[PDB]
Amino acid sequence: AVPPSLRLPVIEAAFPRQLHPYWPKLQETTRTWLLEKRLMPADKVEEYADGLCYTDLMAGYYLGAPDEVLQAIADYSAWFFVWDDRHDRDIVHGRAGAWRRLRGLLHTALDSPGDHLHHEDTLVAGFADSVRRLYAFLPATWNARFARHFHTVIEAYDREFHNRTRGIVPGVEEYLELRRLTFAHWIWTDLLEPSSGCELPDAVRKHPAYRRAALLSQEFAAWYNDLCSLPKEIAGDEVHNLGISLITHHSLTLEEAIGEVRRRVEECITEFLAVERDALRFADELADGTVRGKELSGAVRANVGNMRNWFSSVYWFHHESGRYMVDSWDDRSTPPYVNN
Numbered sequence: 428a429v430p431p432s433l434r435l436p437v438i439e440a441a442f443p444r445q446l447h448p449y450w451p452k453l454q455e456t457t458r459t460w461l462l463e464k465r466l467m468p469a470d471k472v473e474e475y476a477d478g479l480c481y482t483d484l485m486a487g488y489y490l491g492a493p494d495e496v497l498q499a500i501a502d503y504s505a506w507f508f509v510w511d512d513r514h515d516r517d518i519v520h521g522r523a524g525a526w527r528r529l530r531g532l533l534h535t536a537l538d539s540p541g542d543h544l545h546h547e548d549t550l551v552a553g554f555a556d557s558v559r560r561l562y563a564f565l566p567a568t569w570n571a572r573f574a575r576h577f578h579t580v581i582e583a584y585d586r587e588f589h590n591r592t593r594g595i596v597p598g599v600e601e602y603l604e605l606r607r608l609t610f611a612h613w614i615w616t617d618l619l620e621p622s623s624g625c626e627l628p629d630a631v632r633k634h635p636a637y638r639r640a641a642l643l644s645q646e647f648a649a650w651y652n653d654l655c656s657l658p659k660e661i662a663g664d665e666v667h668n669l670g671i672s673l674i675t676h677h678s679l680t681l682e683e684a685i686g687e688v689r690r691r692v693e694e695c696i697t698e699f700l701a702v703e704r705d706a707l708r709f710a711d712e713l714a715d716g717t718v719r720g721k722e723l724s725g726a727v728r729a730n731v732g733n734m735r736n737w738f739s740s741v742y743w744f745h746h747e748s749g750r751y752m753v754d755s756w757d758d759r760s761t762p763p764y765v766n767n
């Protein structure tokens with residue numbers, strides 16, 4: 428059961444949870460990968476990794492993915508959480524130089540991951556290992572798009588470093604634009620495609636119904652995270668959260684800001700339901716009688732289905748993951764799974 432202030436009856440009633448059959452192996456394989464790549468201290472991996480639920484989150488999202496595709500996605504996603512923690516710790520400890528060098532290495536390793544598979548920086552080497560594997564599933568045109576999108580994410584993280592070290596809370600609208608990048612909306616959208624085994628042509632993925640359904644799936648996930656991660660983020664001096672922008676720039680109380688975020692999250696659901704019809708109608712029209720049309724139609728259908736699965740996977744993740752359980756920590760500003 429979910430607390431009333433975080434509960435979304437439409438998710439519970441109309442977005443039934445799904446789980447990929449590979450999840451039991453995925454859980455352990457990603458945990459062992461975090462161990463062997465030295466991405467988190469060994470004792471923190473053993474105490475906290477399974478409870479963090481990072482593999483559950485991806486196994487509830489990319490249904491139908493080949494096991495090896497899901498494994499690369501889950502390793503990358505676990506890496507992404509660790510990167511979010513390293514970024515936080517670099518800000519808290521004022522390690523501007525360490526962050527700038529990491530930012531530069533990630534840009535280089537994103538373009539040529541093979542060259543960085545054995546880099547002395549374990550966070551860079553782990554990044555490169557997951558990215559090299561992701562680059563092996565589809566043609567190089569998809570790899571270049573993933574790279575374009577993630578270069579932008581890195582720079583959004585750099586903007587967040589600038590904001591936090593200066594004490595800048597972005598305006599609401601500025602935040603909403605930045606949040607499509609710091610949440611990596613377009614990376615999760617790109618990853619739908621190796622999960623269904625088909626690189627979509629630009630004309631298909633840029634169709635207004637596909638693009639809007641993909642956007643709303645990610646807006647829901649990012650803003651629902653804002654809602655559920657607000658307590659940990661206030662405690663940790665994080666400034667990036669729709670609720671914090673609302674409190675800071677529109678004088679809302681905490682109760683008012685929580686209600687406003689929850690309403691925006693609710694609207695993403697019912698807006699998505701409307702555009703999902705259009706996206707599935709588009710899928711049907713792609714089935715033009717040809718083999719290629721059937722392939723594209725099935726790929727779009729699977730991708731839209733996973734856009735929908737993201738809603739339920741993100742919803743339950745936030746109530747299962749130890750990542751958000753600030754009330755249980757000795758120091759609410761320093762989560763126990765973070766290397767301080």
Ligand SMILES: NCCCCCC(O)(P(=O)(O)O)P(=O)(O)O
Pocket residue numbers: 507508511609610652656750
């Ligand atoms: N899909 C999860 C992306 C990882 C980003 C981490 C967060 O969502 P973010 O820093 O983006 O708010 P969290 O609230 O857990 O710190």
Ligand SMILES: [Mg+2]
Pocket residue numbers: 511
């Ligand atoms: Mg964070």
Ligand SMILES: [Mg+2]
Pocket residue numbers: 511609
């Ligand atoms: Mg972050």
Ligand SMILES: [Mg+2]
Pocket residue numbers: 652653656657660
């Ligand atoms: Mg958050």
